[PDB]
Structure formats: structure tokens, C-alpha cells
Design an enzyme around this catalytic site. Structure first.
Site, PDB file in Angstrom:
ATOM      1  N   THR A   1       3.896  -3.334 -12.172  1.00  0.00           N
ATOM      2  CA  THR A   1       5.272  -3.014 -11.829  1.00  0.00           C
ATOM      3  C   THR A   1       6.088  -4.299 -11.676  1.00  0.00           C
ATOM      4  OG1 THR A   1       5.717  -2.995  -9.408  1.00  0.00           O
ATOM      5  CG2 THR A   1       4.072  -1.443 -10.235  1.00  0.00           C
TER       6      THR A   1
ATOM      7  N   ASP B   1      -6.899  -3.430  -3.084  1.00  0.00           N
ATOM      8  CA  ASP B   1      -7.949  -4.382  -3.454  1.00  0.00           C
ATOM      9  C   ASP B   1      -7.801  -5.803  -2.908  1.00  0.00           C
ATOM     10  OD1 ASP B   1      -8.897  -3.183  -6.822  1.00  0.00           O
ATOM     11  OD2 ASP B   1      -9.076  -2.296  -4.819  1.00  0.00           O
TER      12      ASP B   1
ATOM     13  N   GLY C   1     -11.847  -0.868  -5.612  1.00  0.00           N
ATOM     14  CA  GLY C   1     -12.309  -2.149  -6.104  1.00  0.00           C
ATOM     15  C   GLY C   1     -12.434  -2.145  -7.613  1.00  0.00           C
TER      16      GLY C   1
END
Ligand code: NA
Ligand code: NA
Ligand code: NA
Ligand code: NA
Lengths: 440, 422, 440, 422
Positions: free
Chosen positions: B180, B208, B252
Site C-alpha cells: 500500500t 510480522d 509469519g
């Protein structure tokens, strides 16, 4: 920047020089690390690596400060003979979340990674190291610490106040202790230095290494200390209750006292997190009661609810001297005094406000005796693992701390001479100002 | 430390200089604030060798802060907000904090929230855009997800800028992953091409904690908390069955920070499989067998990006479980009775409200985003490094990514806790 | 009324008569209760007291039913010699919140209140009572059960499926067990009756007494069973995540599967509590997939979000027979099937909805392995205390249950023949209808 | 059972007949619902003595339920709501559930929320009254307290009915203790005196679970949960100090249901002092001494209504702590070092959001309140007994109160857990 450093009002050092930051090392490193193997040799330090004290440049960039801190890490050569060293542990001062995690991680790191000969846990603070107390010392083993990190408090117990230095080192010799971990605050570490000195005086091969906790005492140095994050989580819970109360009473005031002796990080952070504090009083911003009543008045001018957060170390200049059993400055209960002042003020103005209710919440014990959050458990486990690494490598008279997202070793004299305090012109306190009622 | 850097799948830079780190500012700062100090990229030197230490690196990062002289006319500025990609704890805290700081510290003319990511910016979606005022955002920080809605995928930058131009947006805050943010640059470029006075400012999003030039991203701490709870359940199940195996899948995609931290925090994982350490199913089965030689329980943590050789991945949580059951069946002799329970708490991790600490974090990032944006910053993201807040151009932030250092102190701790081959 | 009773689809009894409700008692009550003293004699039952099965009058009022249930309570005279009885415990079936609390309360009540000779805990369900398994039996004592109630699962372990009855009673005699508590569901209690019978067949002084759990199996009788309240708390948490997801996706659908084999109390109650369910599918209301797609369509006609709650026992008539290891009816994964049907339906209508996302949440294990809430701990402790009282007083072949806010004793044959199910015209299901999307 | 009955400080009836239990209904039920079965007061008989058991009691309680024929004209009815007394978990759930059921199942003309208790009904307060619509109540169930606000004390019934009459209220729901319900009767009486077609329906509120003809009141279960957490903290503190005493104060003005249940649930209390068992400070000190003979820790639970002989009470939590410290000082010889920590989690118990289970409960009570009120019921409260929902006239409900039965199975369990004198 969110915080700053200021001299402590009881400092051992008048000014900190690179020498004051030099970490003491017991003489000799005659042993290879029992965990170091050719393949993982890369993972073990050969020389002492450093990190800037102030990563700000003057304008490669040069630091505004000459100071350098020693980084904590597993070492290739160590001072104590693994299979022969005896580790001791004692928790002093008031309790806070994460003590059992520290006890557990110190214990398991010593046994699993260093195949240590034994781990001893002394009962109820330094008292457990007195001639009488030594009698209650317990043996910590894999099975005794496996699930303690799930509970608040300390299974070893704690207590405030030092003990005769001569007696404490007497028991350490009598039990064959090579490394003594002192978990606790300012006073706790001052005792640690006294023990370290007594040991140095006797020529005994002993390391005293501190694992500090700060939310409940005068100590305040690392960017993060174990238990802090959990205290904030609970403080927010107390703030929500205070808000529910305030909004449920016509011209109701929710007063909630939080921890913070010389720093207002807890209060300041809970205030922003909860996004429900209207007035936030911290030690760094001492203001009179008239200015408080003034902020409340401005709040009640366009609202029926007011939540006031107040750090215990605030408003000490509001009344009735000395130090407590742990060595901290005595405090007047600002929680009670403030609640009274507010009730007096709204009383004398019963005309401006038809009805009014002031409710006081003190979540102190529920914050201190709380089990740690998972993130504190991770932090506690890591602080403790590194403490065992550095102490096995001969580090003594210091504490393991965390600055700029890195674990460092800091001599106790320095740790007890400087304080990490809110920078009233920092990003954090600016958010609290934005959120709270403005004088103008 | 505990992480290392690796070229992002799609890097714009393949080396970094000091100029790349200097933040782009809109021209002029005429208006006074209604109420550039640097930090070292690497605070390590090279030796107490007498007199003020010099950094090993030449790089410097600009520190985020409210400015006395700002670029936009406070009372005349319009703020826009969009949340893209996958949801994670704290999105609402970011939306709220941005809105309130603009509305309370700058008195901006209006705040606008575009719906379902960039979709809400295209001709069509622009229809759903809503006006964000105090009352509409005052209590959204108690909910997971995003009130604005989100969506994955880009839209035509032409249409989006038409939208921004029509609604008169001076600042557009893009909350999302590097994908984004890459799109944010494309929006910033089209706007400058038209001579429109608009800043595009990104606020990084990733559970993450994959984002480079960063030591922590919002949502990451909440995730570890929930991941640990999941592990607790896996352990409960595993310990309750003779030769029980509890398999837990954790966020992850390319990194195993959450899995590793949750492994240490819980201290209950017996095997931790992460994307930074791919290994054969044969080895996993050998680790499991080793565990069962001295225990009747086994907890296996596995990151979504692990075992991809067994645009994105395939459900490794299911594959792994399937193979563990098969491995145990084939050895029903050695392990009389065995049980395998699979736990996928994925949506329960990223869809929950933020922990207080993450709330504080989100609020701080947001508040600082508005301060630097109002003062002209554009084409950059707000980030946290070395306990400080810094501005980082998008091209740099999306060129590299953080990953586990199998030799750092974090991973070394999970190695000690988990079963060892030798 | 919120619920109703229906015959089980595998019942041992064709019809329940007052005789079927008569609780078996081992012959003899030659011992005074070790806790009964003249002062508290008032607290001990001399005769069996009852409570109506259906407190509804026909129109003092007379019950619509002739049935009466025996109330559980401490007795003045007991069957087993306290200081000489040996108590056994085994947990079978899948785990659910509260198992450790039941193990702890049975253990402490036996030791503290009855000064029992010993408490034995059998490992992993009935397997622990097999000739091979018996070998793993552990001794439960005050110190072993003190803090287990803080964890999910069972420290004894569990397993599904029965074992050779001859073997199980063989070990019970071999170990001198006088009372065997069977904690678990429908199959668990069917085994309990088989053991009870085998023991009766051999003339051995043994009582088999059941402490039932139901959320995870076909069993469903008491107004409240241990673990239920905690399951609802967690189910709501799963529903909130599903809602956050749904509202974050344009035309997003949050599908969350909850427990409920033949009853939809969990789903129905989580649906109302969370006040965020749009569609709630339970076993008592089996509807086709077309009617579901129809409800979703009506929802998406004026909204972009849809949260669908679905009990595992719903839609079993939607596809592809027999019983599982615990004796429950096999089930097709309605969670997966439904999610697929929804994705197919929104696919074939991509035109009515530009974008669409379906997210499926299965919080099964996180609900089952969860530690109990404080209220369940209280319930667990009370169910267990009364179970020990009644079994010491000779009760056998029965379960301790709770009906109309009272603890009763129900023979296993009855408990496994009737089911407590949602009354679609009851106050609870009416709230779910009010809250969810309406067909018309 | 585990409770017994005792004449309420202010009873209106001093004996009860079957007529007293029959609920008062407004005249006529003309309109069809837009979409009286009894239950036995005592389900115990008197013996399986052949053929259908007869209740030991003649009393019957009416069961709450939606009716097919209702009293008010659905589309024309106006609903009013007020929350009085002290706050407790679930108030918002009650407000919300009432609003949504009236607005969604009956399409009432409007819902009104009066502020800060009866104050909001008097000429003056009537000014603050607000219109309750879907959007205003859709998410309030995530907060503690009451959005409407509350207050203790009565107002002039004349003024309140003037208010109801002016705003055209057909149904007024009174959420509060027996005090607010007593006032509800006075409001119902003044209205009938004027010939106004208005129902006054109460929804019982008490964390104590003090309410008669009831086995459970909303908020009570949440309180036990929080009380247990408080006890956990007290234990942590106590076990952490040599001869440590953790004193925890819990809700319980005239009853100790919360303290007793929290004592058993936690299984960590060593002494539980409740209002149903007043005892001397000498005895408390002897129980503490007994405990210290074989342990270094002591947790003492104390209900707010205990030790009043040591309109309402004085802070017994402080008094008790003060005396324990004094008792230990006087014996500093026997107990070298001792520590006393006092914990008062009062406002943190009653001001928190409700547990899911209480949420379900509050929603159910509320939904049923609107069903019976719309069907004319007045001068009564909704309640739960024997796992069923029943209507009970106010005069009966406020004449008696529940209290602990020191000989029931609940108290017997805390006796076994706590230290014993002999
Ligand atoms: Na208020
Ligand atoms: Na196991
Ligand atoms: Na949506
Ligand atoms: Na103690």
C-alpha cells in the site's frame, strides 16, 4: 525525544565519566564457554563491544557525548568454572510483575546452558541472607521453577531494608555462592554494591549482579524495565473503571492513583493509551492544587465527567520526611490528599454544581501483584539470560539494563546517580497535553 | 542483534546513501504551528579511544516531531485516511488518533475516511467516503479491524487523485504494508504531476514486524500475547493425550518474529518452525520422535511461511498436521495411541482489539504522522527505531525487510527451549 | 420456557418412570459421617429429600409430572468406612474447562472432609484402567492438586473409547478402589454403568459415580454443566473477531463454528451475549443451504457485513456414518461445508456484489483447552463436593446433575436417554430470532 | 439451599398469600403482538407416595413471556428508562436490550433515557432526557457504568409524572435496588391517580444478589470474577512477605454471597468475614494467630457489611487493617517481621463491563421486561428463579431479602477452606 536524563537527588556520583561506566570484571577468564562450539563460535564475543550513550550527532557522525556503554552478550571465555559454580538469587523491595519469570530464567539458564552445580534462592529479600534467615534458603531446580512465571509476586518472597553486610557475605561463603543476582530497585542495588564491596574486601571469588525493577521505587534508568508494560495494561483497566464511574455521576470525578516516584511514564502512558484521562498529574510537572481545581473547573464547564490520573510521586510539595525501609524518599498519600481537596473545592461551589461525586481508585496492589503479560515474560526471560551470561563471564557490581533497544551493562554507582524522567517537551508528554484539559 | 536485513522481494534501491534517507518536504512553511534533528542509523562506534565516539555508519535518520513552522494552512486543510491490506490490531487506534490530532491540535477543515482500501478512492468507491468527526471516532479504539474497511489490490492512480482533488484533500494517510505504501508513492507522484498541493504520508502496518528501518510495528505485541494464549491451548491439548501433538500456526509470511517471541514467552514450544529456517519433513519427524523418546507431549509452532517447498503460500498448518498423523500412523507400533490437534488462531490474532501498549504505540505513530505531514513531509512513513521515532522515505523502507537472525539472542533462546537433534 | 426435554436417539430407556429415577445405593450405612457433630447435625440428611421434575402445576399445586428427583446432600450415615476407603478418578472423552477443578475438589473433599485413606488418579481415560495402563496410575495428594485448577486440560490426561470391562474392574480390585468417579460425557457414563454392573456382578463393594461434562459430546441434561459458562465467554471472543473481520471486508462474511451436538445453547447464548450475530444455525433448527443463502442475501441487501454462527451439530443432513471413539454420532465438518457453500453462492453472484470475502473461524480447541472462569470453578468445586458426599453415602450408577438451581442425583440410564434441547418457541431462541435476520 | 429469607429493613408485607404474587395488569389487551402459566414457588413435595407430587407451598409465581395480545398500541408507545442507585456491571446491556427490543420487535414511537436516576425525571432534570435510537445504543454494552447516568435519592413523584405525561411515556423501566423500586411504586400510584395510561416496570439491580424471590441478579457473576482476581493479588502479596496479611474488601452490605462465592472459587482465602456472621476482633485475631502457627501467609476476605459494631456503614476494610497492624505490633516478638496490605477493589468491581454470561442475563431480563410491560404488566419487577423467568410485584420483592445460610452447602465449603478455631 520522549524522555531525558537528570541527576538523582541522592547520587553516589557527582558527574558521570567514561570511567564511571567501566564495568568491573572479576580477575580471569580461564574457561571456554560450555556452549561455544566451532560452528557457533560466531555467536560468542571475544572483545567488549560498545554502543553510544547518546546516538545524537553534532554535525561519519560523531556523538554529542563521549560516553559509551558496554553491550551485554554471551562470551567465548568465562570467569567461573561452569560445573563448579553456585548461583544465588534474592528478590528485594516491593513486588512487581515478572519476578518469578526472572527467577525461572536465571535458574534454567544456569542449569541448561552452563550446567551449573546448583542454584540457591534466598527467602524474603536480604533477610534471607542474614545469619537467622540463611536457614530458610531453598534449592531451586528445574522442577521448582517450571510454572512459577504464571503467578504474581515472588516464590522466594521479598522484604525491604538491608542487613548486616558482614552477615550476608558470611552466608554466601558458607554456602559457596559464586554469583549473587540481586533483583530489585534503587535500595536493592545499593545493597548489592555493599555486598560486592564486602566480598572484594575479603578476596572472595564472588560476583554480585543486579536485575533491576523500577515501577515501584526511585530507580529509573532503562528505556524499558520488566513489569512496566503489564503495569500499564492494568493501569488502563483502572482508568476505564474510573471513567465509567465519572460518567455515571452528575459532575462526577474519577481519581485514580498510579505508580511513579520520580517519573510519570506509567501515568503518562496509561493516560494516552486509555484516551480517557482529562487531567494527568506527574512528578515532572508539579503544579499547585489551585491549578488543579482550575483544570477541573474548565472541564466541568463543558462536561459532567472528569477523570484525574495521579502518580504517587506527584504533589509531594503539597504537605507534611526522610526515607522508607527500601531507601526511597518517604511519600505523603497524594491519592488521599487530592481526593479531599477536590471534595472540598466542589463543596464550596455546590452552587455551580448541583450534585457532585468524587470517587477515588487506588489499584496499586492489583498492579504490583499481577502476573506478567506475555511481552514482559519475553523481556524478563531475555534480561535474565543475558545476566547469567555476563555474570558467568565475571561481570560484577553492575546491572543489566536496556537502552536504545539494546541490552547493556551499567555499574551500580551510575545506575543510582541518574534518573530517566519525562521530558515535558517530548512527544509523549505532548500527547498527554493534547488529550487533557488545557489551562489556556 | 536479533534481526538482519534482506533485499525485499521488490526493492527500489539496491544500496543506500544519506540522500536517500532525507525526507521530501512540500515547498514552504509559512504558517505557525497552532500551539531537522537527526539520530544515528547505527549507534555503535569504532572503541573508548579518547574523545567522542564516531558512528560506524555515515547514515542518519530524521527524527519525527511537531514543528513550529508548518506547510499547510491549519484551518483550511482537509485530511484523508485509508487502511489497506490485511487487518491487524490497532487500525482503529490509528484512525482515531489521526482524526483527533488533526481536529484538536490543528482544527483542520475536515477529516475524510475512504472505505475498503484504495477501492474507496476510485471513481465508484469514492461514493462511500465518510466524514470523520470527534463523535464518530471517540470510541472505535475498543474494536478490532478497521471501521473504514480495507481491501487488497491497487486501483488507478488517476482516478484516486481525481477523488482527492474533488474532495480537496491536502494530506492522505496510507495505513498498510509496503504494498500500500508503494501505491502511496504512485499517488504522490501523479499529484505532483498535476501541481496539486497534497502530501501522501504512510503509517506502516504488519503484524510480522517485517518492516525494515524499524524495531517494532503496531499490532506486533498484541499478536505475541494472543499467540501465547494459543500455545497455552495447544499445550493443554497435548499434555492431555498419550503421545499428543499440538500444532499451532502463527503469522509469519517471510519472517518468524511472532513465532520466535511467542515460543520464548510461553516457554512451552517443543519445536518452532519458521520461514528463516526451512527444513525437511524428515527432520521435523525426527525432532518429534526425539521429543517422544522422553515425553508424551509435543507442541509444534509453525509460521505460515514455513515449508513452502513441501502472490503467496499454501496452508502449511494443514499439510504439517496431515503428515504428522501419517508419520504416527506408520509408527503406531512405537506410539500405541497418538493424537494430533491442529490450531489456527490466525483471524483471532489479527482481528482483536489492541493491547494497551500497542494502543499507546498506534496513538503515538498517528499523532506524529499528522505533525510531520502538516509540516510538509511526504513520500515517507513514520517508524520507530532505537526507542525513537523517525521519518523514512518509502523507497528506502520498502527496499529492505527484517528477518530473524538465527544467531541472535532471540533465536538462541528458542533453540535452547526446543528439542535438539544432536 | 428456554428449553425442553426430548428422547435421545440411542436411549437405553424407552420411557422414564419414577422407578428409572430411583438411585441405586450400595447395601448398608453403618458409619456416622466423620464431619457430623451434634451442633451441625442439622446440616446432615437422615432421609432422602426430593424435588419435582417439572415444577409446572396442573391447576396447593400439583405437578404436571409424577416424576421426582433425589436431591444431593451430605448424609448423616454413610456406606464406606472413611479412613479405609480408596477413591479413584479418571477423566474421559475430549477435554473442556474445569476438569482440573473437579479433580482437585474430589481430592480435597475426600482427604479433608472424609480423611480418606487415599485418592488415585488413572491416566488418559479408561486406558489408564486397562492392565497395561493401570501401570501409570498416580497418587493424588493435597500437594499434587493445589494449583491445577489454574490450567486447562486434565493433569490425569484423557482418551476416547472404552476398555475391556473385565480388565478395568480387575485393576480397581487390585488397587482397592471403593469409589470411582467418572468425569466425562455420554460414552464416559455408559462405560461407568458397564463398570458398575461388572462390579455388581462380582459382589465387590464398589461405587461408580459420574461427574458429567457436556459441551463437547452428545450428552445434555442439566440446566448447567461445568465448562459451559467459560465456553460462552470464549465463543463471544471468537464472535467479536469474526465481526471485526466481516465489517472490514466489503461484503465480508464471518463464519464461526461453535460446539453443540444436539443442543444449540452455546451458539444461541453467545449469539445473544455478543449481540453481533446476524445468522445463528443450531441443531434444533435444521434448515437447507438455500434458506441460509437466502438469509445472507437479505442481510447483504442492506449491509456489507454478515456474521454467521454455526453449531457443529447443525446441517448434518447436508451431506456424506456411525459413531466416534467416544460413542457420539460422527459429524461432517459443517464449518468447512458451509464456508464453501457461501463462497460458491457469492461467486455465482459476483455481479450483485463487486468484491466479497468469506472468513472461517474455528475456535474449538481454544474453547476446550481454556482454563475455567471463576464461576465455573465455583460450580466445579460444588459439583465435586456433593459427588463425594453422595458416593461416600453409597450412591452408585448415577451422575450428579443440576436442575432448577438444585443439585440432584440421576441414574445413568436416564441421563443417557433424554436430551435438554433448545425450545424454538422459548424465550432464548426468540431473542436470537429478534437479533438475527428474518426470513420474512 | 445456600440462602435463607429475612424481613427487609423496610417490608410492606409481613406475610405472603397467593394474591400478593398475582401481577397487576393495565386494563385491556386489544392489539395483537407485532410478531398465565405459573411456576411453583417451592418445587419440593410431601414423598414418591404414588401419583403426581403436590407442592409443600400454595404459592405460585407467574412466568414472564411475550404475549399474543398486548395492552399498548405498538406503533404509538413511548418508552422511558432510568437507572438509579449504585452502578454495577450490565446497566448498559439493560438499556441497550430494552431499546432494541422496543425499537425492533414493537416499533415503538420512541425511546427516552432520563439522566442520573430520578433526578432526570424532576422539573429541572427532565431537561437532560435524551432520545434513544439504534445508533446511540448499538455499542454501549462494551462499557461499565450507565450512559444515562445514575443517582441515589428520591424526587417528587408529582414532578416526575408531570414529566412522563409531558413526554408521553407509556412505559417507564426502573433499573435499580429495592429503593428505586419503592419509588417506582409511588410513581405508578400517582399516575393511576391521574388516569394516565402508563406502566412502571422495574428491573432489579444489586451486585450483592440480595434480592428475594431470586436466585441470581445481573452483575453478580462479573463481581465474583473480579473479586477472585483481587484475591489473587492479595495472595500474591501475602505469600511474598514473611508473616504477610492480605486484606480484601468485597461488596456485601447485608449479605456475603460475593465474598463466600469468591472465597470458594479462589480457594485462597484463609479467613472470610461476612455480615451474616459478625464476630469480635478478638476472634479474628485468634483465627489469624492460628493461621500463622502453621504458615507465613494469610488472606482475609471481608464484606463491607461486616464488623459494623466495631443510611449505612463505616469502612471496615480500613478498621480491620488498622487493628491487624496493631495486633501484630503488640506481638512483634512472636512475629518478627510482619506486613499488612489492604486491597479495596470496590469501584473496579462494579464499574467494569459485564462478563459474557451476565451480558446474556441482562439482555434476557430486559427483553422480557418489554414483553410483559407492553402486555400491561405494571408495579412489578422481572426476576429469575429456579432457572426460569418470573414476574414479581414490587411490594413482595422489597419485603424480603436473601442472605447467606451459614448451614447451606456454600458456606459449609468456605468453612472447610478457611482456618478453624477448634
Ligand atoms: Na458524568
Ligand atoms: Na501428552
Ligand atoms: Na463489511
Ligand atoms: Na507469606
Amino acid at each position: 525525544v520522549t524522555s531525558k536524563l537528570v541527576k538523582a537527588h541522592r547520587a553516589m556520583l557527582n558527574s558521570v565519566t567514561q570511567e564511571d561506566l567501566k564495568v568491573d570484571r572479576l580477575p580471569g577468564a580461564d574457561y571456554p564457554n560450555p556452549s561455544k562450539k566451532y560452528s557457533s563460535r560466531t555467536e560468542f564475543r571475544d572483545k567488549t563491544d560498545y554502543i553510544m550513550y547518546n546516538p545524537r550527532p553534532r554535525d561519519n557522525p560523531v556523538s554529542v557525548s563521549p560516553l559509551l556503554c558496554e553491550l551485554a552478550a554471551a562470551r567465548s571465555r568465562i570467569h567461573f568454572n561452569p560445573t563448579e559454580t553456585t548461583i544465588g538469587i534474592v528478590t528485594c523491595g516491593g513486588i512487581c510483575p515478572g519476578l518469578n519469570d526472572v527467577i525461572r530464567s536465571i535458574t534454567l539458564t544456569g542449569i541448561n546452558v552452563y550446567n551449573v552445580k546448583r542454584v540457591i534462592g534466598f527467602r524474603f529479600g536480604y533477610w534471607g541472607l542474614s545469619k537467622k534467615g540463611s536457614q530458610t534458603a531453598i534449592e531451586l531446580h528445574r522442577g521448582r521453577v517450571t510454572n512459577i512465571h504464571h503467578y504474581g509476586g515472588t516464590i522466594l518472597g521479598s522484604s525491604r531494608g538491608p542487613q548486616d553486610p558482614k552477615e550476608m557475605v558470611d552466608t554466601l561463603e558458607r554456602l559457596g555462592v559464586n554469583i549473587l543476582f540481586t533483583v530489585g530497585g534503587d535500595g536493592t542495588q545499593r545493597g548489592a554494591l555493599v555486598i560486592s564491596q564486602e566480598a572484594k574486601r575479603r578476596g572472595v571469588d564472588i560476583s554480585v549482579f543486579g536485575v533491576p525493577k523500577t515501577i515501584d521505587n526511585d530507580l529509573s534508568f532503562s528505556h524499558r524495565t520488566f513489569g512496566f508494560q503489564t503495569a500499564v495494561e492494568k493501569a488502563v483497566q483502572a482508568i476505564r473503571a474510573a471513567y465509567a464511574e465519572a460518567v455515571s455521576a452528575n459532575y462526577g470525578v474519577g481519581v485514580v492513583k498510579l505508580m511513579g516516584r520520580d517519573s510519570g511514564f506509567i501515568a503518562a502512558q496509561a493516560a494516552v493509551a486509555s484516551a480517557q484521562a482529562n487531567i494527568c498529574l506527574v512528578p515532572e510537572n508539579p503544579i499547585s492544587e489551585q491549578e488543579v481545581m482550575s483544570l477541573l473547573e474548565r472541564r466541568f464547564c463543558h462536561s459532567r465527567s472528569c477523570v484525574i490520573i495521579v502518580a504517587e510521586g506527584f504533589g509531594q510539595d503539597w504537605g507534611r520526611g526522610g526515607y522508607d525501609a527500601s531507601g526511597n524518599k518517604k511519600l505523603i498519600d497524594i491519592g488521599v490528599i487530592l481526593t479531599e481537596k477536590v471534595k472540598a473545592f466542589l463543596k464550596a461551589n455546590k452552587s455551580r454544581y448541583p450534585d457532585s461525586t468524587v470517587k477515588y481508585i487506588d489499584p496499586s496492589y492489583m498492579i504490583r501483584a499481577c502476573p506478567p503479560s506475555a511481552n514482559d515474560a519475553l523481556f524478563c526471560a531475555t534480561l535474565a539470560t543475558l545476566a547469567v551470561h555476563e555474570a558467568m563471564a565475571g561481570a560484577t557490581g553492575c546491572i543489566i539494563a536496556m537502552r536504545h533497544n539494546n541490552y547493556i551493562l551499567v555499574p551500580i554507582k551510575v545506575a543510582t546517580s541518574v534518573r530517566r524522567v519525562l521530558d515535558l517537551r517530548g512527544q509523549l508528554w505532548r500527547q498527554v497535553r493534547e488529550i487533557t484539559v488545557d489551562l489556556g
